[PDB]
Amino acid sequence: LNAKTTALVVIDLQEGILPFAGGPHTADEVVNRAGKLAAKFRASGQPVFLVRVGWSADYAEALKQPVDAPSPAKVLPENWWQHPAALGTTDSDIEIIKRQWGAFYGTDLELQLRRRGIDTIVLCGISTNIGVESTARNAWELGFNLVIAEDACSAASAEQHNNSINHIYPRIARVRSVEEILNAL
Amino acid sequence: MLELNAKTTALVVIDLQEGILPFAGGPHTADEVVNRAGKLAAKFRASGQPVFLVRVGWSADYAEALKQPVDAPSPAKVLPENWWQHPAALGTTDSDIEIIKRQWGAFYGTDLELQLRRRGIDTIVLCGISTNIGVESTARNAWELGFNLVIAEDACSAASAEQHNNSINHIYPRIARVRSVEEILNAL
Amino acid sequence: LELNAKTTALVVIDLQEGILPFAGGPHTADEVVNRAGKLAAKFRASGQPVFLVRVGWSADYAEALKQPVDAPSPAKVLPENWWQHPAALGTTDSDIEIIKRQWGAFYGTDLELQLRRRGIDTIVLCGISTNIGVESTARNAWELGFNLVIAEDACSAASAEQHNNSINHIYPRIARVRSVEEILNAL
Amino acid sequence: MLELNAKTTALVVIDLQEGILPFAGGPHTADEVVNRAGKLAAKFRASGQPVFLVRVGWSADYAEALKQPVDAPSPAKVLPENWWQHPAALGTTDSDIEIIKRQWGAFYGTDLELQLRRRGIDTIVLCGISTNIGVESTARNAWELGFNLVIAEDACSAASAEQHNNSINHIYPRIARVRSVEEILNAL
Secondary structure, three states, X not given: OOHHHEEEEEEOOOOOOHHHOOEOOOHHHHHHHHHHHHHHHHHOOOOEEEEEEOOOOOXXXXXXXXXXXXXXXXXXXXXXXXOOHHHOOOOOOEEEEEOOXXXXXXXXXHHHHHHOOOOEEEEEXXXXXXXXXXXXXXXXXXXXXEEEEEEEEEEXXXXXXXXXXXXXXXXXXXXXXXXXXXXXX | OXXXXXXXXXXXXXXXXXXXXXXXXXXXXXXXXXHHHHHHHHHHHHOOOOEEEEEEOOOOOOOOOOOOOOXXXXXXXXXXXXXXXXXXXXXXXXXXXXXXXXXXXXOOOOOHHHHHHHOOOOEEEEEEEOOOOHHXXXXXXXXXXXXXXXXXXXXXXXOOHHHHHHHHHXXXXXXXXXXXXXXXXXXX | OOOOHHHEEEEXXXXXXXXXXXXXXXOOHHHHHHHHHHHHHHHHHXXXXXXXXXXXXXXXOOOOOOOOOOOOOOOOOOOOOOOOOOHHHOOOOOOEEEEEOOOOOOOOOOHHHHHHHOOOXXXXXXXXXXXXXXXXXXXXXXXXXXXXXXXXXXXXXXXXXXXXXXXXXXXXXXXXXXXXXXXXXXX | OOOXXXXXXXXXXXXXXXXXXXXXXXXXXXXXXXXXXXXXXXXXXXXXXXXXXXXXXXXXXXXXXXXXXXXXXXXXXXXXXXXXXXXXXXXXXXXXXEEEEOOOOOOOOOOHHHHHHHOOOOEEEEEEEOOOOHHHHHHHHHHHOOOEEEEEEEEEEEOOHHHHHHHHHHOHHHHOEEEOHHHHHHHO
């Protein structure tokens, strides 16, 4: 890829979300590998977007339509928003706050990408078939070249991860290992 | 029993055009999805509610297409002459609102959101081909935009039953109410 | 004026017979149509995209905005010629037809999609009205990151004062403002 | 008599920050706009309704800025240390919603639309500086997006009275109800 026009987008690597990584990769693996990607991006001056999801205590910013399998409006834990230490977060990283699965709606992600001259996104995080996938589908329609770092993603189960990796992502992205991405940058 | 408020409900029919029918594989056939969508559309028309017939495609030069590299690209072949044709069983009428999209999701680059909001629609009944591709990209977008979603499960098909079922079991329940055509017709 | 011709497109706002009566000044409808036609002929000869934007609504006005405002437009039956392109535009099959339902040409259209997927980074903008639909389109285009060039003598507003206020105080901050002959010389 | 449902209305205060105040030429002074906007905000807070405090600016590297060539560019100067500061009369409190924008209009690249829709807001009262620049770009967007708009005329100011008046007289009436702060306070 063209490294000079590539950004890293890291979905929801925050302590509140890590317990939801059931497979195939552990939360610690996803975090370590996202951290390694971020260090490579920073060495070449390419933007690193660290996305987190959540709501105020009153859930005012949340979607509330009726659905068959709703998520409960529970009091979020104290650590909900905390980036894990092993991610290696630093001040130059661009923090994005989202209020639903996809990282574009209601955020500055697109603005930041376009104004920084980015045409390619490397995407990783949790969950592969939920927020990662909503973000990917949007990114592709917006015209960005997409790369999915397969071994820096995880989902509720290996099966749900693999179904997206095998059937959705190949049509909208290049699916690559962290190692392959590091070699291309 | 499902109940819908007809006056704030629209039908959105994804890519039921002759060019796309071959891509259906299961667990409902293309013809089954088309016939069911036509019955849904008949009910919406009898209720005076909007029917959105969405179709996807590009000009001969493919200028409107996404061309980013992907692992499993679709060939830029000449489109068959029937590509855009509505199957007769949809019962297409002049009052149906034709939406033209250039990728999977039916919002980007279209007037779908404009039409829904300006017509006072808060609920979409969604159907078409493919369950986990354009139907799903549309649904994910519509949910984030705040619309209530009802998926007509048996008026959707994907490349395989496994792929349809994965979305119906793991994605759609979190963003929609998943119901049968029977249940939806009974609710309108 | 320095333009990359290969990444430049022409966007012509609402030069349709129903809208021409609204050209009040300082340029006439004939001025705007003639000079938009000159621009379009140059873009076509260069193989660059020409977007012809038109505005309107179905008979039921279902696509129209209906919020309360102080000065609403009446929902009258549109004249038979409302949508017609003036002959002097030289409309051809390769021109890209954009249909909008309000002032700006982006909301609810494929204009952005078309520009980006065609590799366009620069827009030459003209049409009616300078401070209404042309300006809403311009403000949007600039926020979206497109380089903007306004063809000052191919725009008109309800009055010269309204046109001039935008040309003097708004457009210079978001665009390069040039005459049609200056733009033709740059392509 | 101006009709508002306070509980589906929000206040959007554009760029009342110390960096921007010096640009208020007329017809209302910076202090007047701040004090009057503060009166609006107090009223909205007393109704339990969202107050959106919008501010404009860029990081030290201007990475978020628009950089296209224009005839009258703004210089890439180091922003003064007071650039982002809310004046005290606004009554900024923890429950106010801070919006950071990177250009004239307050929707592109922000959560403004998300916040309005998810909070059940259908009407915006708009004020701030400058009437025909950031306020107007926000207003044009809001109207196209389908929100009802009310402009608080005497809580806006522009580089000149001529520039303010032109928008108040010729743009805003077509997209908004234009009213005074006193009229708006009485309607809420």
